[model samples]
Target: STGSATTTPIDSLDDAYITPVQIGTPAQTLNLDFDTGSSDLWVFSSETTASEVDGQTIYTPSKSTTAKLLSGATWSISYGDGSSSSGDVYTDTVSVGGLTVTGQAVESAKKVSSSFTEDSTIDGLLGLAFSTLNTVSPTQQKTFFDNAKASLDSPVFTADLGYHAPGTYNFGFIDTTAYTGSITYTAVSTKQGFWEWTSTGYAVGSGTFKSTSIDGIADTGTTLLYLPATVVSAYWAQVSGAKSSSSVGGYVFPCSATLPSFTFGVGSARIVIPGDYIDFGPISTGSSSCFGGIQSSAGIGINIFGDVALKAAFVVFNGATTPTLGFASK
Candidate 1:
């Protein structure tokens, strides 16, 4: 798994199929996270030989058509998780699903670690999240979109995750045309980055709802959502506070028969998360604690609404071109 990733699809909707993302000049299909917030594509690479790196698909210019390694443009990216990767820069034509963008920047990872080696399925991240932070420098830096806008049609993208089941991120076009799936639009808070908000409240198995207006961050990059102590108690209060805190941290609910709904607020929208999603994603973990969905993380920031919350709606990121995200009903 990557230590850091800020990526969504080109748009939110796709056929649930991410054709291999080729890299470099000849193209390398390392499964990268196309993040709107960040502007770099981090691929797993080799310290000894760029080709020796293992993980997702890797593109080597020496092995491909017209290619040139920007190893000369050395840079390093540090993540919030404490893990980091650095390498030379290489810009060449890159393609994803028939769409091509020329002179795209790709970081050929020259150094990695056990974190990079573990969970392995997650090879790298393509940050698509909106951010003012730039690798250019601490002073004045432009987002990846600031540079990419010239290459795209409206310089817009949407994250259509439902029709694709687990979902695939799409860029350039909002595609209101292909967005024929259930539509739910939530008015957004005019905040900056990472749809941060207050939990406001919850409901138990279609029962009475409660309050939890603490600070929270709605993130699509993560698979699970997390909350703070007071709010976690408010949620567990529904099931008799029958939740267990794990050694790794995070509360767990064992009761499933009467799972309730979790409604999150952003701007003016009262977003309600359906049961199963409030439980565990359709994916299985085989844990005994209801083993998923809705957990606690008592800390600086309260809860983070991840994919579970994301799947419940058709979220749109209209940034890079303009920094605004629309959460419409799906």
Candidate 2:
């Protein structure tokens, strides 16, 4: 079977993408961050502390006759940004778009970080990374995709993230009309439980392509694109007033400066990110200096092709035995 869902950016900066998910018996719909960086389908629930609840939607398993406690099972996840959440586990009917998965593990958040509490638009996160990265204890749980893969017409899902616009996520089959030209496929390594792959190289605006092998993960959860310091520096240099400021953190430039587009290679194909997409809004409300969407991955330990890059192309997360990633211009 096949399914489709619309994913909308949370803000003008495209901070993150939120998708609606149906959970429990009567289907409690909640807007969740469809994160490809982690693996654990967690949600803010009735068990969460009332003080921590903001305007976000909460899932109440008690209202679902299909809900069953996964006795002795628990889950806790911490993100690189220091945000975290932990809770007990329950199995229930979970549906994405039109696809349905029965007895799916749905983590009920009991504790959440302040960042999560403050984001009223996001109720929780639905991890899409490999199930090997699931944080459940006693017995690990498969991701919703992994559990539903066998029943799907094809073991694949596509990410069509947009720039300040609503995109789409398609399961079981590829939407042929969503992309242009032919798709470029590359080998993917699930060793780290991420959609990790090696990019051929990159180019700064209209400059020549650099034939360097860059390793990184295609993470939809992250907000920015992180590359090697050298590449990031090259891109920023093209902008007259760009500088690495410790106060604002990372690279910032005058709001009026002309930004340059970034290009990265996927095999023989090259995807170009428009300059407007890199001009992340001002650092502060009325500030003249604006933050860059691309930054150095020096301290991050690994480079990340986040939303900034994902929005430029159509991405396919193939679930074949030897998985591969496909990129196409849109």
Candidate 3:
């Protein structure tokens, strides 16, 4: 059987996808960000100081009879945005979509960064990456998907992150109906506990493809597509009035300027990102400056195929022998 969950854009921050999840016995539901970038199922909870949680929903362990404290066990996570969360752990029943897994380690946050508090809508994060990346220290914990994989018909899930539209994250199965054309598969390197793959080449606005290999991870948690500095500059060079704006925290351009289509090569597949989708959003309210979704991964050391890039294609996270990435035009 397959478990499917719908992922929608956060009303205020259209950066990531939000999935509804239920935890503990009476089923306390909260909207969580399904992140393939990291491993740890954490949520805002009673343990979180009132000042730190802001307007987000809190998960109370004491309310559920099935909740068992994993004494001394704790988890902490630091995100790419410099935001962080940390807390104690509890074993409870967790459900995503219609799929339920008992005795799952659910981390209840004791502290959260200002960024998370201000975001407000997201209650937590459900990590879909390998268990090796889990943050629980002393004794690392397994994610919901990791614990439930043995029971699934196939150790796989498909990400159909659509452009400015609702998408579905399907677990335990792959629905051929979710994508069109052929799914070109490429081997993934899991040494980093991420779905990392190498792109053969890339092109700007239908220009000639360059044979520059780019290694990156498919991270649903991140908002933008980050590439090497030189590559990003090349893409932006095609656009008029585009500049690296320190004031906006990344590349930005006049709202009236046109952007060129960008495409990434994955094996035999060429996934193209439309020009207009490159504008993440307005850099500021009531301003004509827009932030560019494709930025330089200079200091970060690694590239990321975040929401901006993933939304342009149907991605299959193959966890079977020889982990692979399958891409198809949706």
Candidate 4:
């Protein structure tokens, strides 16, 4: 599941209706979409021209005295959205919040357009999710997280949010005393990086989500934790102080305060769901106008780690190791 399509401005960037944020110094700012779907650190360069999606500011390596490009390497990657750009590898002293990660990988593209160039509010994306989705692989496969995974604290965690204030763009360690246990991970074929999965079924209050276990894949490209509609509805019915409301989305409750907890069984790990998320906001279309966090896919047979669920935990992907995925909390 995609962590989020757009992010609320970080405090790191002050006086920024869309200004750059500070990692610590040097007076730098940037735009970011906290996504869990695809992972990478791509930004437009001065060589880029104005086009449809060219609303964001471009960072030219040639212009930035601090930027350096890697020799013998060029980028021309494209997305499923029919947009593409080309450029070379480069390095610059980079950081986030109080933490600093030197030698971080950044994707520099040249052919970007107005769609990305025009929208100053949404300039770039900060992929702080899993490692397997890295955008810096040898074949241009790894993501920013992959490049920085080695620098993370043990069980590195996150708090996916939608706050819209300026300053302190945080992407660091989290204390888990206020949360639940981690979700166990299974292996996936490395041919597509770390984009495939096989679910063995799920659990909620000692109950199985599906009659039989099924292989499931975790993704940030998608927006919600998709499951069999009926199965999800059945689980939603389990919450105690929960009542069905169709406003927030589908299968949401009006009151999540007195609901039961659930879990997603991932082989050796079980991701626990507490009462706070029981109603799953967006909790009914006419209820409170809140967007429900969970969704039903009927026969979709796909289990996603969309923004909601992922915001509450930390995940690590393994690309160096074939058919293996890892998970932990910071």
| Candidate No. with top TM-score | 2
Error of 2 at 133 (Å): 0.6
Error of 1 at 252 (Å): 1.6
lDDT of 2 by residue, 230-320 (tens): 9999999999989999988899999998889999999988999999999888899999999999999999899999999999999999999
Q: Per-residue lDDT tens digits of candidate 4, residues 1-330?
A: 111112343332111122232221353456555444456666655555555344555555665566666555565545443445555566665554444555555566656644445455655655544546554535544454455455655323243332133212223343344234653557665444434565555666666554345444455333456666655676667754344445433654444245555565556565655545433344334554333446676545455655334433445444333434444422
Which stretch of 10 consecutive residues in model 1 shows the poorest summed lDDT?
1-10
Give per-model TM-scores. 0.73, 0.99, 0.97, 0.57
Instruction: Give model 3's TM-score versus the native structure.
Output: 0.97
Highest lDDT model number = 2
* Better TM-score candidate (2, 4): 2
lDDT of 3 by residue, 178-237 (tens): 888989999899999999999998999979998888999999999899999999999989
C-alpha positional error of residue 310 in candidate 2 after TM-score superposition, expressed in Å: 0.4
Which 10-residue span in candidate 3 carries the lowest summed lDDT?
A: 9-18
Which scores higher on TM-score, 3 or 4? 3
Give the Cα lDDT of each candidate.
0.53, 0.95, 0.89, 0.48
In model 3, which regions exceed 4 Å deviation? none
What are the clash counts of all predictions, listed in order? 45, 0, 0, 67
